[PDB]
Amino acid sequence: ARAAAFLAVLVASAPRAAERRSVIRSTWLARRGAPGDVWARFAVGTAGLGAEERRALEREQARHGDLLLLPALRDAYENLTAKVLAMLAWLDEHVAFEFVLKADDDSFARLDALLAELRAREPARRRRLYWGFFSGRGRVKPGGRWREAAWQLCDYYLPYALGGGYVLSADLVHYLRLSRDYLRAWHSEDVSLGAWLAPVDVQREHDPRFDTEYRSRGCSNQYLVTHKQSLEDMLEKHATLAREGRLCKREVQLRLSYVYDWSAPPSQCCQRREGIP
């Protein structure tokens, strides 16, 4: 009796962040196409929470029905690697889906546009898809004695999609589930996931329509996913989409973007330039 949808959506959300969930479920999670198109949840770890805290979550779930409560996962602010692995492994086991969008509770995604884009891909462009805004020259954090047991794999991080939002095909999620007990953690979930997929025949696809870096590049009506959004920002975008059928009251390019050059060494992937959102 597994739930089934075309596009699963998993929004990482800490136990206490109920007010953010309220805005998200009332805005971009509500505009989710026809029945059967989307299955969407907020992924919350409940390990180590007390009775009152767990009761609050159960009340929220009874009211809204959109929480994925992961009882074995200790929710943590510093590194969401464990959370991302847990919620994807759960999804592989429990939901029949073709693609999954991972997002944060400061993301905003146009689910209707994402659905239409995915539906328009032919088989080849759907197979083993890992889709988002990639970095191949991510600077690696200072190491210590822990590196003896966990070598640095590259002078820069292995190519990975930034964690403001990325999409995976179901097949890739199954590989993560199968391999779960072996996987190493890097300092950030997005970095970790890119390393996880390093061995795999995977169709990485860089797309400037993902405004998913640690700072937003502004507002483009072309964006499918954008990150670092305040609640006010989410409410404004939701309203503009409803009023005018576009994301932005005013498009603005705050920071230059790039197109990932797969013909170059990864350190040379990412020249910032005009003309790209």
Added chain:
Amino acid sequence: ARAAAFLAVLVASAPRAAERRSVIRSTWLARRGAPGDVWARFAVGTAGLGAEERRALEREQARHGDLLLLPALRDAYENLTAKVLAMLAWLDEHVAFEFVLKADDDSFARLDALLAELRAREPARRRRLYWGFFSGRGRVKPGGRWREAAWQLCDYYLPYALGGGYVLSADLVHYLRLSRDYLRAWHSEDVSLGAWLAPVDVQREHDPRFDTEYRSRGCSNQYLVTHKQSLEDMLEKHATLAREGRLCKREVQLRLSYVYDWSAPPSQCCQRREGIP
């Protein structure tokens, strides 16, 4: 009724290379410790071979009993990636073992010394072991349009043990079996395997006692495994070990070695220097 041994040994060998197998089975594969210590085979792909060719192999197997014939594997000279994955996946399913040595038919290994070294490791030093001579600054081959579907993961190859000989714990081999259908091929089996293990919590251990690079560094009595050995070389070493209890009639350092610096970025791993075999 699975075969069981402490150390499995898999020597990659092409169908036609029967004379090399004859020397190997008569030399370093024969000095293999007590019953139950070693299970050793020559891994040969038989896909696409004709009746006469297959009969020859079956006759060899009836006489010697030391072939691993892989019927689904098309034996190929240019890249042994497929062979290595096939023979390790087979081993995971069919043999109970703690460690496996992968070697070529121009390798020479001191199996007694390898056994003693592995037996002397405490639990921590046995867990998830990937042991050999590592490179972190392997220069990457020129790409073409195929790179769009298979991005270059690093400016240099991800750290990997050179293919003249390396050792894996059984747990790691199980991860490869589980993940088999997803794994990408690089241009060489050794490079490929290092990438395969990139996502994993793996205890990589560099050891100058592995003379396993594309050129031998000479002859050291400290070597556990050495590569680029002629049949004459194998016969001489076998004789010296029997006569004098050492590998080398004369130790000679033809090329400098290095100690892999895990505290540095991988591009800076590998300074060649005196004092190291």
